[PDB]
Design an enzyme around this catalytic site. Structure first.
Site, short mmCIF file in Angstrom:
data_model
loop_
_atom_site.label_atom_id
_atom_site.label_comp_id
_atom_site.label_asym_id
_atom_site.label_seq_id
_atom_site.Cartn_x
_atom_site.Cartn_y
_atom_site.Cartn_z
N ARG A 28 0.81 -1.17 0.00
CA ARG A 28 0.00 0.00 0.00
C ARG A 28 0.87 1.26 0.00
NH1 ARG A 28 -5.35 1.32 3.28
NH2 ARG A 28 -5.69 3.49 2.53
N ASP A 87 -6.80 -2.59 2.25
CA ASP A 87 -7.31 -1.70 3.26
C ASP A 87 -7.93 -2.59 4.35
OD1 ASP A 87 -8.06 0.88 4.25
OD2 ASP A 87 -10.17 0.43 3.66
N1 LIG Z 1 -11.14 2.13 12.79
C1 LIG Z 1 -10.01 2.37 12.11
N2 LIG Z 1 -9.43 1.41 11.37
C2 LIG Z 1 -8.31 1.70 10.70
N3 LIG Z 1 -7.62 2.84 10.65
C3 LIG Z 1 -8.22 3.79 11.40
C4 LIG Z 1 -9.35 3.62 12.18
N4 LIG Z 1 -9.70 4.76 12.85
C5 LIG Z 1 -8.78 5.64 12.47
N5 LIG Z 1 -7.87 5.08 11.60
C6 LIG Z 1 -6.82 5.89 10.99
O1 LIG Z 1 -7.22 6.12 9.62
C7 LIG Z 1 -6.02 6.57 9.00
C8 LIG Z 1 -6.28 6.85 7.52
O2 LIG Z 1 -6.62 5.60 6.96
P1 LIG Z 1 -7.12 5.47 5.41
O3 LIG Z 1 -7.03 3.99 5.15
O4 LIG Z 1 -6.29 6.38 4.57
C9 LIG Z 1 -8.81 5.98 5.38
P2 LIG Z 1 -9.84 4.98 4.24
O5 LIG Z 1 -9.97 3.58 4.79
O6 LIG Z 1 -9.37 5.12 2.87
O7 LIG Z 1 -11.30 5.64 4.30
P3 LIG Z 1 -12.52 5.36 5.29
O8 LIG Z 1 -12.03 5.49 6.69
O9 LIG Z 1 -13.52 6.46 4.91
O10 LIG Z 1 -12.98 3.95 5.02
C10 LIG Z 1 -4.98 5.57 9.46
O11 LIG Z 1 -3.67 5.98 9.28
C11 LIG Z 1 -5.41 5.29 10.92
O12 LIG Z 1 -4.55 5.95 11.84
CA LIG Z 2 -11.75 2.10 4.28
CA LIG Z 3 -8.40 2.34 6.03
CL LIG Z 4 -1.87 0.89 -2.89
#
Ligand SMILES: Nc1ncnc2c1ncn2[C@@H]1O[C@H](COP(=O)(O)CP(=O)(O)OP(=O)(O)O)[C@@H](O)[C@H]1O
Ligand SMILES: [Ca+2]
Ligand SMILES: [Ca+2]
Ligand SMILES: [Cl-]
Ligand SMILES: N#Cc1ccc(CSc2nc3c(=O)[nH]c(N)nc3[nH]2)c(F)c1
Ligand SMILES: [Ca+2]
Ligand SMILES: [Ca+2]
Ligand SMILES: [Cl-]
Length: 159
Positions: free
Chosen positions: A83, A96
């Site tokens: 990733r 993810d």
């Molecule tokens: N429940 C959770 N699970 C995973 N990561 C979480 C989390 N709550 C907060 N985070 C934080 O979320 C940050 C950003 O994660 P991303 O994967 O970029 C968001 P995404 O999954 O693309 O979108 P989404 O949260 O709208 O599904 C991580 O670096 C982590 O610190």
């Molecule tokens: Ca997500």
């Molecule tokens: Ca995520």
């Molecule tokens: Cl990726």
């Protein structure tokens, strides 16, 4: 021990391969055991739509880790599966791993918000969750079955 529920998504670099590899890595998390794996679902992308369809799934992981220690491992697995962070919001990704639920806990730290802030609005999270945990009750007492009975979500197709 607690049961954590982890959402899996992948839409890059052979999602079936990524998700199977992730299941192997999730088993290797210390202090933790996979209890249940959902079916794999092929879902149209929500948010930005100019990306491939996702493979979505959910896993029940029994653990004695602290919630942020579980996050440490799920982030490690995502990074170890290639990733890469791009500038665009909600872009495609190889893997993810969202922590949906961590027992009945409500967690609000700098790195971790549980329940996942939007899961109750996302069929691609709720339907695989219901497959593995039909009796689930959220920390706020809401029943998974009642959400899925009452709210309109599009039907999911298996992968
Ligand atoms: N429940 C959770 N699970 C995973 N990561 C979480 C989390 N709550 C907060 N985070 C934080 O979320 C940050 C950003 O994660 P991303 O994967 O970029 C968001 P995404 O999954 O693309 O979108 P989404 O949260 O709208 O599904 C991580 O670096 C982590 O610190
Ligand atoms: Ca997500
Ligand atoms: Ca995520
Ligand atoms: Cl990726
Ligand atoms: N309106 C909307 C909306 C916006 C952003 C996100 C978060 S980015 C994202 N992740 C996944 C995934 O795992 N599966 C599928 N199908 N679409 C995805 N989009 C969202 F979920 C919904
Ligand atoms: Ca785009
Ligand atoms: Ca602070
Ligand atoms: Cl809740």
């Amino acid at each position: 021990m607690t049961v954590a529920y982890i959402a899996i998504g992948s839409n890059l670099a052979s999602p079936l391969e990524q998700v199977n590899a992730a299941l192997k890595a999730l088993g290797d998390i210390p202090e933790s055991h996979i209890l249940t794996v959902s079916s794999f679902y092929r879902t149209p992308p929500l948010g930005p739509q100019d990306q491939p369809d996702y493979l979505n799934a959910a896993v029940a992981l029994e653990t004695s880790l602290a919630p942020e220690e579980l996050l440490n491992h799920t982030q490690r697995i995502e990074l170890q599966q290639g990733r890469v962070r791009k500038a665009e919001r909600w872009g495609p990704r190889t893997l993810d791993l969202d922590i949906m639920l961590f027992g009945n806990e409500v967690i609000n730290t700098e790195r971790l918000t549980v329940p996942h802030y939007d899961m109750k609005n996302r069929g691609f999270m709720l339907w695989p969750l219901f497959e593995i945990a039909p009796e689930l009750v959220f920390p706020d007492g809401e029943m998974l079955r009642q959400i899925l009975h009452t709210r309109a979500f599009d039907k999911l197709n298996k992968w």
